[PDB]
C-alpha cells in the first residue's frame, strides 16, 4: 500500500529510487530528500540558533559592517530571487509532481530563516555558525547534483529535463550557493577599534581552537599557524597557546570530586571507574558513534571496487558484442562510481579524526583530573596511612597508573569495534565467496596463539636486554668514577677487556636472539595475510562450480586485510584492559585511604595579651597514633597550657612523647576525649629538616612577600651570614636534589630561618638545636629563641633536652609514658633535687599510541605498542637551541652510520626489500592473469598450475622478507653497534684528565648507557619500517602509472604537497615532543618534594598554595601536550586527503582508458586494489622519518665522543725503556713548569731540583702552592709547558705513557675501590701471585678482615664504591696495591687526608718496612708526619722556595718552613 503513496507524490519516470540508470541521484530523490531535508534542517536548527542568540547581549563584542556582511546578505537575497524565478519556470506537467513544488517552497522558507540568521549571527557570534555552514554545504551539493543530473539527461537524451531556463537558473544557484559558502567559511570578522583599545593581552595568546568554525575544526586547519611558526624557529614554552576553555585541571578535578563524593555517599559499594565514566563518558559515546560510521565507510570501499570491475566487464562485453531495445551502458556511471570512491575516502578521513579528537580529549581530561585529585588527597591523607607506603610508590601511582587510565581510552572503543568490523567483514565475504571464507577465518584463528607466543618470547628477551644493559651501565659507572686511579695505575686495559667481555658475550648475544625472533615475527606478519587469500581461493576453486572471476578475486583481497587486522589486535586490547583494571584497583585503594580527623584541634584567631593562653589542651585529652589495627594511645590525659611570650618547653626521652605533643598541636593525631585549641597562625620546625629544590632565598621566603629589611635581619639573627657569604651565588645558590648538599646544621638553620621569617603567631619547635654547634646554638638562643630575641612576643613551644636552652624557659613540662607527669617553672623543679625532672635532666620514556585498526600499518603500530620497549628522554637539549633553527639536516651523520654498518650489507638489505615487494606485486599480477583466464573460460581450467605459481610467488615474497630482516639484524645493526661502542670506549678511556674534570660523569654515563641502547635496539627498526614502506609506495605508484601513464601528472604535484607537509610536521612535531617531554617531569618531582614535607606544608597551612602550584604545572604540561597530539591529526588529515585524491585520479584515468577501448577488468582490479591501500602507508612514512630523525642524534653523540683528542701515545716504539728502569729512583726536574689547562696560569714555575736515590722527601706549602701538581707532573697527567723531567738518566717526555705509569708506584690522594673481588681490586691483570697478595694484605693489616669477610678470602666481593669497607680499609687497600708494584719510586699523596691516625701509623710502618728501599715523595698535608724525612721541598706560589734538610730549615727562624711550623703550632720554641 504505502509505496503507492510515494508513487503518487513522484510523477517522473525515473521514480523516487535513490540511484538512477546513469549512476547519479534521480531528480525525485534530489528534490524529495537532499534539498528537502536540508531545508528542514535549516528550519529547525537555524530557528533554534535564532532563539538562542537573541538572548545574548548585543554589545559583548563589536564588529564593523564591512563588505563581508553586505555581500552575504545581498547574495542570499539573490539566491531567494533565483529560487522564486525558477519556481515560476515550472510547467504544467512539472507542477503535477509534488516533490518539485514542495522542495522549492521549503527551500524558500529555509532561505528566509538563513537570511535572518546571517544578520543575527554576525553581531552575536565570534565564529561562523555551524548550522549555516552545513546548510550551505548541503544546498551547494544538492544543486550541483541537480546540475549534473540535467547535464547527463541532456547529453544522453537530447532534452533539457526541466527546460533550458531551469538549467541556467540551477547553474546560477550552484554559483551563488558556493559563493555564500565560501564567504561564510573563509573571511574573518573585522573587530571595531574599541576592542583593540580595550585589549591588554601580553601573556600566551588564546587558543585558536576556540575561534575555529566547524570546517576548520574538521580539517584541523587551526594548527597550520603553529606548524608554520614551529617550522620557522625553535619553539619555546612562550610560543605555545593557552589551553581551551574546559581543559583547566581545577574545573575537571572539581567535577570528578563531586561525582566521586556522590558515589561515596550514595552507594555502599563505591567505584572510581563508574565515577570516571559518569563524568567524562559522553565524549566516548560520541567517539563510538564516529567509529561506527568509520567502520561502515571503510567496508563500503570493496563494494565500490566490485561494482566498478563489474561495470568495466559489462561495458567491454557490450562493446565487443556490437563490434561483432535495451539501453546501451553509459560511461558516466564509471565516473560517478569513481567520485563515489573519492567521497567515501574523504568522509572516512573526516569522521576518523573526530573520533581520535574525542578519545584523546577524554584521556587528557582523565589525566588532569586524577593527577589533581591524587595531589589534593595526599595533603589530607593521615600521617600513618602515608607511612604505610613509600613516597616512590605513590609517585608511581601518579606516574604509571594515571598514564594507564589515559591510554585505556584509545583501546576502549575497540572492544566493540573489533567484533563489529569482523562481523561486517565475514558477512561481506560470505556474500562474495560463500562457504570458502571459513578456511581463511580458521587460518587467522590458528595463527593468533602462535603470535601471542612469539610476543611472549620477545617480552622475555627485552627484559633480559634491560638486565644486561643495567649490568654494563654499572661497569661503566665503576670505570668512570675511578678514572684517575685507572690512569695512574695504567689499569685501563684489563677493565676495558672486562667491559668488552660483558658487552660482547652477553648483550650482543641476547640482541642477536632478539633480532632473530623479530625476523620470525616479520615473516609471520608477512606470510599470514597471503595464506588466508591463497587457501580461500584453493577451497573455492576445487569445490565451487563458479568461475573464480576478477570481481570475486580483488575485493576479496581487499576484505581479507579488514578481516585480519582487527582479529590480530584483540589480545592487545584485553591486555590493556587488565592493566587498567589493576591501575583502578590501586587508585581506588588510595582514594579510600584514611584521612586526618578534621576537628582534632580547634583553630581560632590569635591572642593579643601577654601571659594569656594560646595553646590549651584540656578536659584531660587523649590522642591516638593509629586507629588500625587497634586504638594505639599516643598521649593519655594531657593537660597543658602555653601562653603568649612564655617559652614553654617539653622534656622527655626518645619515644617518651616528644613528637606526639607537637603533632597534637599540628592536628595530626586523632582525639578521643577532651578538647584542644590553638590560637593564631602556626609555624612548625620539623625534627628532620625539609629543604625544597631551589634557592636558599626561596627556601627562606616560602611563599611570603620579600621584605629586604626583615630578610637581612633574619639572616643575621639565625647566623646564616657566614655561610651565605661563602656560598656560590650567596642566597641564590641552589639546594636539594639540584645543587649543593648542605650539612645537617645548615639545613636546621635554614628551616629555623624559614620559621622566623614566616612571622607566625605561634611556634612549635621540634628540637632544632640538636644538629647545631654549641656556640651557634648559644647564638640562636640569644638572637631568636630567647626572651630578648625576635620571637619574644610570639608563643614558643620547644621540645628539647638541651639544659642550656631549657634554662631560659618560662614553663617546663616533663612528658613521659605519654603523660605530662610534671610541669612547672624551672625554679619549681630546681628546689627539689629528688624530683624526677631534676634527676632526668641534670644527671641524665614515551608511547606514541595513535592506532586505528584495519590496516597493516596499524597492526605493526599495535604490536609494537604491546611489546612497548622503551625510548628514554633527552637531556641538555636547551644548549643547542642557541643555533635557533637553521634546519639543515646533517647528512654526514647518516653516511657515517651507513659506514658503521657494512655498506654492502646495507645494499643487500635494501635489495631484498625491493625483491620482496617485487614478488608481492608479481603475485598480484599473476592473480589478475589467472582470474582473466577463468573469466574467459567460464570455469577454472588447470587450477593446480595457476594456484601453485601464485603460492610460489607468495612464499618467495615471504622468504625475501625473512632474509631481509635476518641480514638487517645479524649483519648491519649489530656490527654497527659493536663498532660504535668499541670506538667510543677506546676514545673515552684515552682522553686526557681535563675532559673528565670538565665534563660531568652524568653526561658520559648517559652517552654510554642510553645512546648506545638507542643505537642497539631502536634505530635499525626505524630504518627498516621507513625503507619497506617507501619501497611499497614506490611500487604502488609504479603499478598505477603502468595502468595509466597519465597518472604521472597528478603524482608530481601530490608529491610536492607531500614533501611540504612532511617537512612542516617533522620540524614542528620534533619541537613539540621536546616541549612535552621537558614539561612532563616537574609534576612528579614536585609531588616527591611535597611528600617529603607534608607535616611542614600542613604546619604552615600552605596547602592551597601547593595545590595551586601542582594544578598550574599540570596545566602547563597539558598546554604542551595538546598541540603535540593535534599535530598528528593535522598531518594525517592532509595525507589521507592525498590518498583519496590518488584513488580518484587512478579510477578516473582508468575510466578514461575504458572510453578509448583498451581497458580490461583486471587492470582496474589491480590498480585500484593497490590505490586503496596507500592512505596509511603515506603517513607512516612521514612518522618514520620523524622517528629516524629523533633517534640518529644518538649516533651524532657517539661520534662526538669518538672524536676526542687523546693523550700522548701509550707506547713509543723508538724509546721503550728497559724492564729494570727506574732501578734507583733518581729524579731531576730541569726548568720544569706546567699549567693544569690552557685556560689557567702556570701552577708550577721554574722547578729545578735533584732528588737523590733512596732518599725520602717531603713537600710542603700554603694553600695554592701547587703541591698536588707533582702527583700529576711525574705521571704526565699534565704535559710540560717548559723544561723536562729526567728519571734514572731517561727523559720522561720521550717515553710512552704506559711505559711511564706502569713503572711508578703511587698511594693516591683519593682512595678508590672497584666493584669486584678483593683480588680484582689488588691485581686486575692477575700478574702477581696469591701469596704476594696475602703478604701485602698482611703488612697493610687487612688480611684478618679479608678472611673474616667470607670463605672466599681473596675472592670476597666488594660492593660498589667500597660500601662494605671502611675508609681506613680502603686506604690500606691502596697501600697494598702500591706495595705489590716493584718500582723503585713511590709517591705518597696526602694533600687532603684527615680521616684517621690509627691507619696513619700503619702507613708509616709500611713506609719504613716495606718501602724501605724506595725513593719516597710525600705530598704532605699533616705537617707533623714529616719530621723523619731527609730533605723538604717548600713550595710557595709554584716555585721551590727552599730545598733543604728539616734541621737546617728550622735553624733559620725567618725561613718559610719555620713560619709554617709556627702557624701550625708545631714549633713555637
Residue numbers in the entry: 4 to 327, 336 to 855, 890 to 1514
What does the literature reporting this entry say, word for word?
Yeast Cadmium Factor 1 (Ycf1) belongs to the ATP Binding Cassette (ABC) transporter family and sequesters glutathione and glutathione heavy metal conjugates to the vacuole to detoxify reactive oxygen species and heavy metals (Cd2+, Se2+, Hg2+, As2+). Ycf1 belongs to the C subfamily (termed ABCC), which, in addition to the core architecture, includes several evolutionary additions, including an additional TMD (called TMD0), a lasso domain that links TMD0 and TMD1, and a flexible linker domain called the regulatory domain (R-domain) that connects NBD1 and TMD2. R-domain phosphorylation is necessary for activity, whereas dephosphorylation induces autoinhibition through an undefined mechanism.
Here, we sought to determine the structural changes in the dephosphorylated Ycf1 E1435Q mutant, expressed and purified from the Saccharomyces cerevisiae DSY5 strain. Surprisingly, dephosphorylation of Ycf1 leads to a complete loss of the R-domain density at its interaction site on NBD1 previously observed in the phosphorylated structures. Instead, considerable additional electron potential density was visible within the substrate-binding cavity between TMD1 and TMD2. This density displayed several continuous segments that allowed for the structural assignment of the C-terminal half of the R-domain (residues 890-935) continuous with TMD2 (see Methods for details of structure assignment). Apart from the substantive gross R domain rearrangement, the dephosphorylated Ycf1 architecture remains almost unchanged from the IFwide conformation of phosphorylated Ycf1. At this site, it adopts an unexpected helix-strand hairpin motif constructed of an α-helix (residues 902-912) with pronounced corresponding density in the cryo-EM map. This region encompasses three primary phosphorylation sites on Ycf1 (S903, S908, T911), including the RRAS motif. In conclusion, our dephosphorylated Ycf1 structure shows a dramatic rearrangement of the R-domain that occludes the transporter substrate binding pocket, resembling the peptide-bound state of TAP1/TAP2.
